[PDB]
mmCIF file of all heavy atoms in Angstrom:
data_model
loop_
_atom_site.group_PDB
_atom_site.id
_atom_site.type_symbol
_atom_site.label_atom_id
_atom_site.label_comp_id
_atom_site.label_asym_id
_atom_site.label_seq_id
_atom_site.Cartn_x
_atom_site.Cartn_y
_atom_site.Cartn_z
ATOM 1 N N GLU A 82 111.693 122.569 247.825
ATOM 2 C CA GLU A 82 110.553 121.966 248.518
ATOM 3 C C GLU A 82 110.207 122.813 249.734
ATOM 4 O O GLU A 82 109.062 122.833 250.194
ATOM 5 C CB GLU A 82 110.887 120.549 248.999
ATOM 6 C CG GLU A 82 111.056 119.529 247.895
ATOM 7 C CD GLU A 82 109.759 119.227 247.174
ATOM 8 O OE1 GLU A 82 108.684 119.626 247.680
ATOM 9 O OE2 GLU A 82 109.815 118.582 246.105
ATOM 10 N N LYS A 83 111.212 123.515 250.246
ATOM 11 C CA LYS A 83 111.050 124.349 251.427
ATOM 12 C C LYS A 83 110.684 125.781 251.093
ATOM 13 O O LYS A 83 110.604 126.617 251.985
ATOM 14 C CB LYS A 83 112.338 124.317 252.255
ATOM 15 C CG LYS A 83 112.704 122.912 252.712
ATOM 16 C CD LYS A 83 114.138 122.791 253.210
ATOM 17 C CE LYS A 83 114.333 123.456 254.560
ATOM 18 N NZ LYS A 83 115.626 123.050 255.193
ATOM 19 N N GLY A 84 110.446 126.069 249.818
ATOM 20 C CA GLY A 84 110.105 127.430 249.444
ATOM 21 C C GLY A 84 111.312 128.116 248.836
ATOM 22 O O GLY A 84 112.449 127.854 249.234
ATOM 23 N N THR A 85 111.077 129.007 247.882
ATOM 24 C CA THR A 85 112.180 129.673 247.210
ATOM 25 C C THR A 85 112.656 131.000 247.791
ATOM 26 O O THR A 85 113.762 131.444 247.475
ATOM 27 C CB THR A 85 111.847 129.892 245.741
ATOM 28 O OG1 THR A 85 110.768 130.827 245.634
ATOM 29 C CG2 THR A 85 111.438 128.580 245.105
ATOM 30 N N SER A 86 111.841 131.630 248.635
ATOM 31 C CA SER A 86 112.208 132.914 249.227
ATOM 32 C C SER A 86 111.511 133.111 250.582
ATOM 33 O O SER A 86 110.331 132.795 250.727
ATOM 34 C CB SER A 86 111.832 134.039 248.261
ATOM 35 O OG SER A 86 112.262 135.295 248.745
ATOM 36 N N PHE A 87 112.238 133.630 251.571
ATOM 37 C CA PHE A 87 111.671 133.839 252.903
ATOM 38 C C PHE A 87 111.421 135.300 253.273
ATOM 39 O O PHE A 87 110.418 135.615 253.907
ATOM 40 C CB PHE A 87 112.579 133.241 253.990
ATOM 41 C CG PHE A 87 112.910 131.785 253.799
ATOM 42 C CD1 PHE A 87 114.107 131.271 254.295
ATOM 43 C CD2 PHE A 87 112.008 130.916 253.198
ATOM 44 C CE1 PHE A 87 114.398 129.912 254.200
ATOM 45 C CE2 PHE A 87 112.287 129.553 253.096
ATOM 46 C CZ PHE A 87 113.484 129.049 253.599
ATOM 47 N N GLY A 88 112.340 136.186 252.904
ATOM 48 C CA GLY A 88 112.181 137.584 253.257
ATOM 49 C C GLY A 88 112.601 137.777 254.706
ATOM 50 O O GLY A 88 112.245 138.759 255.367
ATOM 51 N N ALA A 89 113.368 136.814 255.199
ATOM 52 C CA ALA A 89 113.865 136.826 256.562
ATOM 53 C C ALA A 89 115.169 136.040 256.545
ATOM 54 O O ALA A 89 115.446 135.321 255.596
ATOM 55 C CB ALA A 89 112.852 136.165 257.493
ATOM 56 N N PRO A 90 115.990 136.171 257.595
ATOM 57 C CA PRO A 90 117.270 135.459 257.673
ATOM 58 C C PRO A 90 117.115 133.947 257.547
ATOM 59 O O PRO A 90 116.071 133.400 257.902
ATOM 60 C CB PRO A 90 117.790 135.844 259.056
ATOM 61 C CG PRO A 90 117.194 137.198 259.279
ATOM 62 C CD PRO A 90 115.783 137.009 258.785
ATOM 63 N N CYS A 91 118.154 133.282 257.034
ATOM 64 C CA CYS A 91 118.166 131.821 256.917
ATOM 65 C C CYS A 91 119.596 131.321 257.153
ATOM 66 O O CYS A 91 120.559 132.064 256.960
ATOM 67 C CB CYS A 91 117.641 131.352 255.545
ATOM 68 S SG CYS A 91 118.744 131.526 254.105
ATOM 69 N N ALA A 92 119.726 130.073 257.591
ATOM 70 C CA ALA A 92 121.034 129.480 257.868
ATOM 71 C C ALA A 92 122.007 129.482 256.669
ATOM 72 O O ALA A 92 123.205 129.710 256.832
ATOM 73 C CB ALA A 92 120.846 128.055 258.389
ATOM 74 N N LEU A 93 121.495 129.245 255.464
ATOM 75 C CA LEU A 93 122.350 129.213 254.274
ATOM 76 C C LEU A 93 123.153 130.484 253.982
ATOM 77 O O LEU A 93 124.205 130.414 253.354
ATOM 78 C CB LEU A 93 121.522 128.831 253.050
ATOM 79 C CG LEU A 93 120.934 127.411 253.132
ATOM 80 C CD1 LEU A 93 120.201 127.087 251.837
ATOM 81 C CD2 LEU A 93 122.048 126.383 253.402
ATOM 82 N N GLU A 94 122.667 131.640 254.426
ATOM 83 C CA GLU A 94 123.381 132.903 254.204
ATOM 84 C C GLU A 94 124.687 132.919 255.006
ATOM 85 O O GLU A 94 125.709 133.416 254.539
ATOM 86 C CB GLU A 94 122.498 134.095 254.605
ATOM 87 C CG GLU A 94 121.346 134.354 253.645
ATOM 88 C CD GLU A 94 120.359 135.386 254.172
ATOM 89 O OE1 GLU A 94 119.504 135.020 255.005
ATOM 90 O OE2 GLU A 94 120.442 136.563 253.764
ATOM 91 N N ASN A 95 124.649 132.369 256.214
ATOM 92 C CA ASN A 95 125.834 132.298 257.058
ATOM 93 C C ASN A 95 126.905 131.395 256.411
ATOM 94 O O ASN A 95 128.089 131.752 256.374
ATOM 95 C CB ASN A 95 125.456 131.760 258.443
ATOM 96 C CG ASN A 95 124.743 132.797 259.308
ATOM 97 O OD1 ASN A 95 124.035 133.671 258.813
ATOM 98 N ND2 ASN A 95 124.914 132.683 260.615
ATOM 99 N N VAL A 96 126.486 130.241 255.891
ATOM 100 C CA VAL A 96 127.416 129.297 255.263
ATOM 101 C C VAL A 96 128.143 129.886 254.055
ATOM 102 O O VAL A 96 129.376 129.875 254.000
ATOM 103 C CB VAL A 96 126.702 128.006 254.808
ATOM 104 C CG1 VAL A 96 127.699 127.067 254.178
ATOM 105 C CG2 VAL A 96 126.027 127.329 255.990
ATOM 106 N N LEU A 97 127.387 130.399 253.088
ATOM 107 C CA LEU A 97 127.998 130.982 251.891
ATOM 108 C C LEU A 97 128.929 132.135 252.277
ATOM 109 O O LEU A 97 129.993 132.309 251.679
ATOM 110 C CB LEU A 97 126.929 131.507 250.915
ATOM 111 C CG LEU A 97 127.208 131.342 249.414
ATOM 112 C CD1 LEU A 97 126.316 132.281 248.618
ATOM 113 C CD2 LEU A 97 128.648 131.635 249.100
ATOM 114 N N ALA A 98 128.526 132.917 253.274
ATOM 115 C CA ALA A 98 129.338 134.053 253.709
ATOM 116 C C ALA A 98 130.736 133.630 254.176
ATOM 117 O O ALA A 98 131.723 134.262 253.823
ATOM 118 C CB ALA A 98 128.611 134.829 254.820
ATOM 119 N N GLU A 99 130.817 132.564 254.964
ATOM 120 C CA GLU A 99 132.104 132.080 255.450
ATOM 121 C C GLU A 99 132.989 131.642 254.299
ATOM 122 O O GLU A 99 134.172 131.990 254.250
ATOM 123 C CB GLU A 99 131.924 130.900 256.403
ATOM 124 C CG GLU A 99 131.555 131.282 257.812
ATOM 125 C CD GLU A 99 131.510 130.077 258.739
ATOM 126 O OE1 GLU A 99 130.658 129.193 258.519
ATOM 127 O OE2 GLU A 99 132.329 130.011 259.683
ATOM 128 N N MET A 100 132.414 130.867 253.383
ATOM 129 C CA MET A 100 133.147 130.367 252.221
ATOM 130 C C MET A 100 133.770 131.502 251.401
ATOM 131 O O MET A 100 134.906 131.383 250.933
ATOM 132 C CB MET A 100 132.223 129.523 251.330
ATOM 133 C CG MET A 100 131.711 128.236 252.006
ATOM 134 S SD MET A 100 130.644 127.197 250.953
ATOM 135 C CE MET A 100 131.874 126.212 250.107
ATOM 136 N N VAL A 101 133.044 132.606 251.239
ATOM 137 C CA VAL A 101 133.571 133.725 250.474
ATOM 138 C C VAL A 101 134.723 134.403 251.221
ATOM 139 O O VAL A 101 135.737 134.747 250.608
ATOM 140 C CB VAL A 101 132.469 134.774 250.154
ATOM 141 C CG1 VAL A 101 133.092 136.003 249.510
ATOM 142 C CG2 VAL A 101 131.435 134.173 249.217
ATOM 143 N N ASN A 102 134.570 134.583 252.534
ATOM 144 C CA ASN A 102 135.608 135.216 253.352
ATOM 145 C C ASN A 102 136.914 134.428 253.328
ATOM 146 O O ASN A 102 137.993 135.014 253.248
ATOM 147 C CB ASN A 102 135.148 135.378 254.807
ATOM 148 C CG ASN A 102 134.008 136.360 254.949
ATOM 149 O OD1 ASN A 102 133.885 137.291 254.155
ATOM 150 N ND2 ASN A 102 133.176 136.174 255.969
ATOM 151 N N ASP A 103 136.823 133.103 253.400
ATOM 152 C CA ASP A 103 138.024 132.283 253.379
ATOM 153 C C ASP A 103 138.664 132.266 252.007
ATOM 154 O O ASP A 103 139.876 132.158 251.895
ATOM 155 C CB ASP A 103 137.721 130.842 253.810
ATOM 156 C CG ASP A 103 137.318 130.744 255.274
ATOM 157 O OD1 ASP A 103 137.866 131.517 256.096
ATOM 158 O OD2 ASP A 103 136.463 129.889 255.609
ATOM 159 N N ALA A 104 137.851 132.393 250.963
ATOM 160 C CA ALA A 104 138.356 132.357 249.593
ATOM 161 C C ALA A 104 139.036 133.624 249.057
ATOM 162 O O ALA A 104 140.074 133.540 248.410
ATOM 163 C CB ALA A 104 137.229 131.948 248.646
ATOM 164 N N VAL A 105 138.456 134.792 249.310
ATOM 165 C CA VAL A 105 139.030 136.027 248.790
ATOM 166 C C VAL A 105 139.808 136.808 249.846
ATOM 167 O O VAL A 105 139.237 137.268 250.837
ATOM 168 C CB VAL A 105 137.927 136.931 248.185
ATOM 169 C CG1 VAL A 105 138.564 138.097 247.421
ATOM 170 C CG2 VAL A 105 137.034 136.113 247.261
ATOM 171 N N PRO A 106 141.129 136.978 249.633
ATOM 172 C CA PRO A 106 142.057 137.688 250.523
ATOM 173 C C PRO A 106 141.561 139.003 251.126
ATOM 174 O O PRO A 106 141.626 139.191 252.337
ATOM 175 C CB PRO A 106 143.289 137.895 249.643
ATOM 176 C CG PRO A 106 143.284 136.677 248.780
ATOM 177 C CD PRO A 106 141.821 136.554 248.399
ATOM 178 N N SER A 107 141.054 139.909 250.298
ATOM 179 C CA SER A 107 140.597 141.201 250.815
ATOM 180 C C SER A 107 139.253 141.249 251.540
ATOM 181 O O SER A 107 138.963 142.227 252.226
ATOM 182 C CB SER A 107 140.582 142.226 249.686
ATOM 183 O OG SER A 107 139.775 141.766 248.624
ATOM 184 N N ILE A 108 138.442 140.201 251.404
ATOM 185 C CA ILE A 108 137.121 140.171 252.029
ATOM 186 C C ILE A 108 137.075 139.612 253.457
ATOM 187 O O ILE A 108 137.432 138.462 253.700
ATOM 188 C CB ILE A 108 136.131 139.398 251.124
ATOM 189 C CG1 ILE A 108 135.944 140.176 249.815
ATOM 190 C CG2 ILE A 108 134.801 139.195 251.833
ATOM 191 C CD1 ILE A 108 135.160 139.447 248.739
ATOM 192 N N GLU A 109 136.629 140.450 254.392
ATOM 193 C CA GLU A 109 136.508 140.084 255.803
ATOM 194 C C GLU A 109 135.039 140.137 256.223
ATOM 195 O O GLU A 109 134.653 139.543 257.221
ATOM 196 C CB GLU A 109 137.308 141.049 256.682
ATOM 197 C CG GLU A 109 138.727 141.306 256.201
ATOM 198 C CD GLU A 109 139.503 142.258 257.113
ATOM 199 O OE1 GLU A 109 138.919 143.263 257.580
ATOM 200 O OE2 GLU A 109 140.705 142.007 257.353
ATOM 201 N N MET A 110 134.234 140.865 255.455
ATOM 202 C CA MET A 110 132.803 141.013 255.715
ATOM 203 C C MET A 110 132.144 141.142 254.335
ATOM 204 O O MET A 110 132.679 141.832 253.469
ATOM 205 C CB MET A 110 132.561 142.264 256.574
ATOM 206 C CG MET A 110 131.145 142.411 257.106
ATOM 207 S SD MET A 110 130.943 143.729 258.342
ATOM 208 C CE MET A 110 131.356 142.851 259.848
ATOM 209 N N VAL A 111 131.003 140.478 254.123
ATOM 210 C CA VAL A 111 130.329 140.517 252.810
ATOM 211 C C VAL A 111 128.855 140.869 252.879
ATOM 212 O O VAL A 111 128.228 140.748 253.924
ATOM 213 C CB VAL A 111 130.359 139.150 252.076
ATOM 214 C CG1 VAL A 111 130.334 139.368 250.577
ATOM 215 C CG2 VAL A 111 131.543 138.342 252.493
ATOM 216 N N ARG A 112 128.310 141.271 251.736
ATOM 217 C CA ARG A 112 126.900 141.613 251.608
ATOM 218 C C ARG A 112 126.434 141.109 250.248
ATOM 219 O O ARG A 112 127.013 141.459 249.215
ATOM 220 C CB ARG A 112 126.688 143.131 251.707
ATOM 221 C CG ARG A 112 125.314 143.618 251.219
ATOM 222 C CD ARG A 112 124.144 142.897 251.892
ATOM 223 N NE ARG A 112 123.960 143.296 253.286
ATOM 224 C CZ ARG A 112 123.455 144.461 253.684
ATOM 225 N NH1 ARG A 112 123.062 145.363 252.794
ATOM 226 N NH2 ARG A 112 123.330 144.722 254.979
ATOM 227 N N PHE A 113 125.395 140.284 250.252
ATOM 228 C CA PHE A 113 124.867 139.721 249.017
ATOM 229 C C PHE A 113 123.818 140.599 248.341
ATOM 230 O O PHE A 113 122.972 141.199 249.011
ATOM 231 C CB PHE A 113 124.248 138.343 249.271
ATOM 232 C CG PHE A 113 125.224 137.314 249.755
ATOM 233 C CD1 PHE A 113 125.199 136.881 251.080
ATOM 234 C CD2 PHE A 113 126.170 136.774 248.890
ATOM 235 C CE1 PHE A 113 126.107 135.919 251.536
ATOM 236 C CE2 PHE A 113 127.085 135.814 249.333
ATOM 237 C CZ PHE A 113 127.051 135.386 250.658
ATOM 238 N N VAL A 114 123.892 140.666 247.012
ATOM 239 C CA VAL A 114 122.938 141.419 246.206
ATOM 240 C C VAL A 114 122.472 140.475 245.097
ATOM 241 O O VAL A 114 122.810 139.291 245.124
ATOM 242 C CB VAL A 114 123.581 142.679 245.611
ATOM 243 C CG1 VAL A 114 124.042 143.574 246.724
ATOM 244 C CG2 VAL A 114 124.749 142.307 244.723
ATOM 245 N N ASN A 115 121.719 140.970 244.119
ATOM 246 C CA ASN A 115 121.244 140.074 243.070
ATOM 247 C C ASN A 115 121.986 140.067 241.724
ATOM 248 O O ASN A 115 121.724 139.205 240.891
ATOM 249 C CB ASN A 115 119.748 140.288 242.855
ATOM 250 C CG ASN A 115 118.967 140.258 244.164
ATOM 251 O OD1 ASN A 115 118.804 141.280 244.827
ATOM 252 N ND2 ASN A 115 118.502 139.080 244.549
ATOM 253 N N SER A 116 122.918 140.995 241.508
ATOM 254 C CA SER A 116 123.687 141.014 240.251
ATOM 255 C C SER A 116 125.014 141.761 240.366
ATOM 256 O O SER A 116 125.297 142.394 241.383
ATOM 257 C CB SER A 116 122.860 141.632 239.110
ATOM 258 O OG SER A 116 122.543 142.987 239.364
ATOM 259 N N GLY A 117 125.828 141.668 239.317
ATOM 260 C CA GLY A 117 127.112 142.350 239.299
ATOM 261 C C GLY A 117 126.916 143.856 239.244
ATOM 262 O O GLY A 117 127.671 144.623 239.851
ATOM 263 N N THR A 118 125.898 144.281 238.501
ATOM 264 C CA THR A 118 125.569 145.695 238.389
ATOM 265 C C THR A 118 125.233 146.232 239.783
ATOM 266 O O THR A 118 125.705 147.300 240.173
ATOM 267 C CB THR A 118 124.375 145.902 237.425
ATOM 268 O OG1 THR A 118 124.836 145.770 236.073
ATOM 269 C CG2 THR A 118 123.738 147.271 237.616
ATOM 270 N N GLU A 119 124.431 145.484 240.540
ATOM 271 C CA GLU A 119 124.066 145.905 241.898
ATOM 272 C C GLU A 119 125.292 145.941 242.801
ATOM 273 O O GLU A 119 125.378 146.769 243.697
ATOM 274 C CB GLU A 119 123.026 144.963 242.532
ATOM 275 C CG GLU A 119 121.633 145.021 241.925
ATOM 276 C CD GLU A 119 120.570 144.323 242.786
ATOM 277 O OE1 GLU A 119 120.919 143.451 243.608
ATOM 278 O OE2 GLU A 119 119.375 144.640 242.628
ATOM 279 N N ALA A 120 126.241 145.040 242.574
ATOM 280 C CA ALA A 120 127.447 145.011 243.400
ATOM 281 C C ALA A 120 128.367 146.198 243.096
ATOM 282 O O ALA A 120 128.949 146.795 244.000
ATOM 283 C CB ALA A 120 128.191 143.715 243.184
ATOM 284 N N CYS A 121 128.493 146.547 241.823
ATOM 285 C CA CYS A 121 129.356 147.653 241.462
ATOM 286 C C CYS A 121 128.771 149.002 241.867
ATOM 287 O O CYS A 121 129.504 149.913 242.250
ATOM 288 C CB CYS A 121 129.667 147.605 239.966
ATOM 289 S SG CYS A 121 130.757 146.216 239.540
ATOM 290 N N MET A 122 127.451 149.125 241.802
ATOM 291 C CA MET A 122 126.793 150.367 242.192
ATOM 292 C C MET A 122 126.986 150.620 243.691
ATOM 293 O O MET A 122 127.300 151.735 244.102
ATOM 294 C CB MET A 122 125.297 150.301 241.856
ATOM 295 C CG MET A 122 124.491 151.497 242.334
ATOM 296 S SD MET A 122 122.903 151.657 241.490
ATOM 297 C CE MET A 122 121.797 150.875 242.636
ATOM 298 N N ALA A 123 126.803 149.582 244.504
ATOM 299 C CA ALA A 123 126.954 149.706 245.949
ATOM 300 C C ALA A 123 128.396 150.008 246.378
ATOM 301 O O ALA A 123 128.624 150.815 247.283
ATOM 302 C CB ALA A 123 126.465 148.437 246.637
ATOM 303 N N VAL A 124 129.370 149.368 245.736
ATOM 304 C CA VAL A 124 130.760 149.603 246.096
ATOM 305 C C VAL A 124 131.171 151.019 245.683
ATOM 306 O O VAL A 124 132.057 151.622 246.296
ATOM 307 C CB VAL A 124 131.696 148.562 245.429
ATOM 308 C CG1 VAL A 124 132.008 148.965 243.992
ATOM 309 C CG2 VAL A 124 132.969 148.421 246.239
ATOM 310 N N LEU A 125 130.525 151.548 244.643
ATOM 311 C CA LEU A 125 130.827 152.894 244.181
ATOM 312 C C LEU A 125 130.332 153.863 245.250
ATOM 313 O O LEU A 125 131.036 154.800 245.619
ATOM 314 C CB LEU A 125 130.110 153.197 242.866
ATOM 315 C CG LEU A 125 130.645 154.351 241.998
ATOM 316 C CD1 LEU A 125 129.612 154.684 240.919
ATOM 317 C CD2 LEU A 125 130.924 155.582 242.827
ATOM 318 N N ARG A 126 129.123 153.632 245.757
ATOM 319 C CA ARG A 126 128.589 154.517 246.774
ATOM 320 C C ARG A 126 129.332 154.402 248.107
ATOM 321 O O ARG A 126 129.400 155.369 248.861
ATOM 322 C CB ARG A 126 127.087 154.284 246.986
ATOM 323 C CG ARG A 126 126.554 155.165 248.115
ATOM 324 C CD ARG A 126 125.116 155.672 247.931
ATOM 325 N NE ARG A 126 124.115 154.669 248.269
ATOM 326 C CZ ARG A 126 123.735 153.698 247.454
ATOM 327 N NH1 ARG A 126 124.268 153.622 246.241
ATOM 328 N NH2 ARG A 126 122.817 152.821 247.851
ATOM 329 N N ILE A 127 129.901 153.231 248.395
ATOM 330 C CA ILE A 127 130.638 153.037 249.644
ATOM 331 C C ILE A 127 132.029 153.686 249.547
ATOM 332 O O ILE A 127 132.552 154.187 250.541
ATOM 333 C CB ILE A 127 130.760 151.525 249.994
ATOM 334 C CG1 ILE A 127 131.137 151.338 251.460
ATOM 335 C CG2 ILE A 127 131.812 150.876 249.139
ATOM 336 C CD1 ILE A 127 130.112 151.906 252.424
ATOM 337 N N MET A 128 132.618 153.686 248.351
ATOM 338 C CA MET A 128 133.927 154.310 248.134
ATOM 339 C C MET A 128 133.886 155.786 248.537
ATOM 340 O O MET A 128 134.795 156.291 249.199
ATOM 341 C CB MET A 128 134.322 154.279 246.657
ATOM 342 C CG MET A 128 134.862 152.981 246.119
ATOM 343 S SD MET A 128 135.655 153.294 244.517
ATOM 344 C CE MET A 128 134.321 152.997 243.415
#
Side-chain angles (χ1 to χ4, degrees):
Chain A
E82 291 292 347
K83 300 165 72 166
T85 67
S86 185
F87 305 152
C91 76
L93 296 184
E94 288 171 280
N95 285 31
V96 180
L97 217 198
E99 279 185 296
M100 296 181 87
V101 173
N102 293 331
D103 293 325
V105 190
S107 56
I108 295 171
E109 312 181 319
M110 189 170 273
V111 209
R112 165 54 72 74
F113 297 108
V114 299
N115 310 88
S116 63
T118 283
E119 290 193 338
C121 290
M122 175 161 97
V124 82
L125 200 193
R126 177 146 79 279
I127 197 61
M128 281 195 268

